[PDB]
Symmetry: D2
Subunit: 248 residues, 4 copies
């Protein structure tokens, strides 16, 4: 029994990590998935890795024209959207003294601005009864060295779920934020050394009660819950999938 | 597809409302379910309503001997516990001026004390990898007229999830709180006398909730099913609000 | 200046630690203070240490009769109550497997039950415009080894502030919870004195500000919630924990 | 008498509402105050209304050059900063469908970007032991019609307090967020008719347990707490001054 039989889903940043794992499980559950991202190469590989009911679209969420084009493709092909997973994101570690206007803009364009407009332009296609999902982060409720702009961006993403819960209740659409903890993705690697990238995993595992970094498939599933009708009476929440990290 | 295939679950207060709906969906998902409660009549009717892989046990959670007996029955029959749903509860509306020592005790015995000991005595039977679930309430994060003791009890239940997340991580057991909002159960009916003024209470909580309706027990069951399942395998210590947005503004 | 000039305050557990420091600063600010507690010895020493506008009353908050007697004394002497500081409390460290019904009762009687009734019986004496204050704990939003009942009790105390904010708004009374982090009091000692410094070193390591709080620093935060500076502050949870819970 | 005797304070958006009331009470408590804002007229009137130990500086917080100039003036005159009150802010009500890139930028430039950089450039002047204060809003923890960007910005401001608590603990500096509820200021007037501005007040008074809109002087005081040594063991918090509104 497929928990998303025939639902159409749109996943932003679906060619890697969380989005990709969520794309797999979604397809596995019988959905049609549009994976969105910038890298052509990784979009195709993802589309291959999934093998079914996926189309891969190239689009930069910081660009209004790329998003307009995305949603045009969505209507040609699947017509409406049951589930939206605003999951594009990135981090640059910089402390307060190091913050430049460009760093601020780079961080907030993809993480917040981009997000905002991907949900805005999906609106005409969203079916009433639809579920939207925003990826924030445990960073949104913590004070971490050099996460200044990223944490603040993610805190802003969670706030958008509250607001959109109010603005869209009139169409029976649920907007929810998922806040991953430490999930094993390329995002840990890309913040230089791969010796000191394992320092970062060992640290976040030490910190988390469950004593391990999360798997992307475990975030996929939590997102699947909020996507499914099992979460039919769940709106506006912040779901922590962090092994207990923020829960003490 | 059976998301709890062959998992043994124990549901406290499983002869009514939330526990019962959660018992159904659990069985539907291929589990074995022990529904616990005080009323003999409603236990049997529930056991009938479910129709399979259920056994109904009579036990008052405020009584240590009833719990000891419960877990003895569990050990005979299914041997171990994969999922525990501490979901027994009740409310008496009383304001601060009205609070009596008995009212305080009644409220806290079932809601907190009982809860505490049902999880304590399940411990030897819990499989590592197991999932425990505590039913608190949006009341835990709100200031509602005459919910003084109930809200405080529920706030305490949520705290136990944090603590037990730390104490039991060494056995890979997840403890999570679910906080329902306004779910259509006999708990709304049994506070007030009139059934005209019990609909006033539903209309009020529906007005308050973004989604504009009282929750269905089957919708709580499902959220509890999530926390019960492996889909929530990296989710510990949380407070899951299933309240249609009520506390999320 | 004297930010509590002529206000009458009642402090529960005022013969030690947080209550005592809060009693000093309160008096310093020109209030009349009733310090409440069980130990006769420590009540008198506190009453001496303060030196002015204090009366010390013996009362166990788990006893209804001791509370009835307390508020009778308050009436005789100062007549009404401007500020109430429900600050009695205690902890026994026990894990889930160790929890006994007695341990559960002991913890919840003082921390919650007692608290509940001290605010109930103060009600007739509270002036409209009054401020009530409840002492919970960072424990209320954390999962600490062996703090099962204490943390849960404190989480319940914070909930009572939300409720009482609603129930008493009609009399313009503010109810607020203060949640201390690690404040240097006898509560750390009474849970070896070598392994009591292990507990301080651990909570200082954990807290951004890198140190255990002083009781005088809690007193002041409680003084804020007591004063008119916190006129438009109701139902809150004020963390005075050096950042501990914030991350 | 005088809880800020000889402390130098810098207040951003100090020619009106919250900042101005906070400027008065600060001066009343024996501080030196720099009130910052864009309007020349209102800066002078504020400087007059206060009457003592104030200097008024014209500066747009969205402009790096205006901030550099501000802190140069501060160096000339008082040399160091004991208390910083990042309190500049503004709101435009727009729902999700109405959000334009410009509206997004306008909102986030003052409320977040500006804020970020006013704290960055104060850093060299801040005395160890200093207290920073950020003005967010109950909006940060709520889902209000048409508050999309403002609420999200304010949610981000609160996040910066957590982070800066970690980053600056090494200099014994406390960073705290204050989240006002409904305070009687020109910010209510300037969104909307003055008939339909007094509703907005009736609505927020209805909502708040204490049954009234807050006074600016009552926010000033709460900010004075966080400014003073009475809050010497208080870092990283979110202080709600909302009459109970968000505390249910
Ligand atoms: N692991 C953790 O600790 C953690 C914690 C909390 C939240 N998260 C969140 O999880 C999300 C994504 O997964 P990940 O970060 O773990 O792995 P990742 O492999 O870094 O995923 C980032 C995804 O975002 C996409 N992306 C970035 N900028 C984009 C743009 N302008 N337009 C479209 N797509 C864009 C990437 O694709 P392209 O670069 O190819 O466009 C990629 O698919 C992020 O929002 C991140 O903040 C991770
Ligand atoms: N309905 C809501 O919206 C809502 C909101 C927040 C929380 N809750 C929580 O939901 C749970 C109950 O479900 P419900 O309220 O929806 O339906 P309900 O009919 O009120 O369920 C109460 C359950 O607890 C059992 N119970 C009470 N005291 C007990 C004891 N001493 N020992 C064993 N069982 C006991 C009841 O059965 P017996 O009478 O046979 O013992 C019944 O099965 C409670 O934990 C309640 O606080 C409900
Ligand atoms: N230090 C921390 O880390 C920390 C953190 C969070 C909260 N707190 C809270 O702060 C409060 C008090 O200060 P403290 O505990 O740090 O110092 P303490 O010296 O342990 O203070 C406890 C106070 O409570 C009183 N008390 C206990 N049971 C009582 C009863 N039945 N009736 C009257 N008084 C009673 C004690 O006096 P008698 O023994 O004479 O009765 C004493 O005055 C407690 O509620 C505690 O939960 C402390
Ligand atoms: N009133 C409420 O209900 C409420 C609730 C939550 C938070 N707040 C916050 O309280 C703060 C301000 O006080 P107010 O809002 O009550 O009244 P207000 O009169 O709107 O205050 C806004 C202040 O910020 C200044 N400002 C705006 N844009 C600026 C810029 N680009 N550069 C420098 N200064 C700028 C204004 O001065 P110029 O116009 O002269 O530049 C004025 O001094 C804001 O942070 C607001 O978000 C208010």
């Amino acid at each position: 029994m497929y928990r998303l039989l025939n639902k159409t889903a749109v996943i932003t940043g679906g060619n890697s990590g969380i989005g990709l794992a969520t794309a797999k499980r979604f397809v596995a559950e019988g959905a049609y998935v549009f994976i969105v991202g910038r890298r052509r190469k990784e979009l195709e590989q993802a589309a291959a890795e999934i093998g079914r009911n996926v189309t891969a679209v190239k689009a930069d969420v910081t660009k209004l024209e790329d998003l307009d084009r995305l949603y045009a493709i969505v209507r040609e092909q699947r017509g409406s959207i049951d589930v939206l997973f605003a999951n594009s994101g990135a981090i640059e570690q910089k402390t307060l003294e190091e913050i430049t206007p460009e760093h601020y803009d780079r961080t907030f364009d993809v993480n917040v601005r981009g997000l905002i407009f991907t949900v805005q332009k999906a609106l005409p296609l969203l079916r009433d009864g639809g579920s939207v999902i925003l990826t924030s982060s445990v960073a949104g409720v913590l004070g971490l060295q050099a996460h200044d702009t990223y944490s603040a961006a993610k805190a802003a993403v969670r706030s958008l779920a509250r607001t959109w819960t109010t603005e869209l209740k009139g169409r029976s659409i649920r907007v929810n934020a998922v806040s991953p903890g430490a999930i094993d993705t390329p995002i840990i690697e890309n913040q230089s050394t791969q010796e000191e990238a394992d320092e970062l995993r060992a640290k976040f595992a030490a910190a988390t009660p469950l004593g391990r970094v999360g798997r992307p498939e475990e975030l996929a599933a939590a997102v699947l819950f909020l996507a499914s009708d099992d979460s039919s009476y769940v709106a506006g929440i912040e779901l922590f999938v962090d092994g207990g990290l923020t829960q003490v």
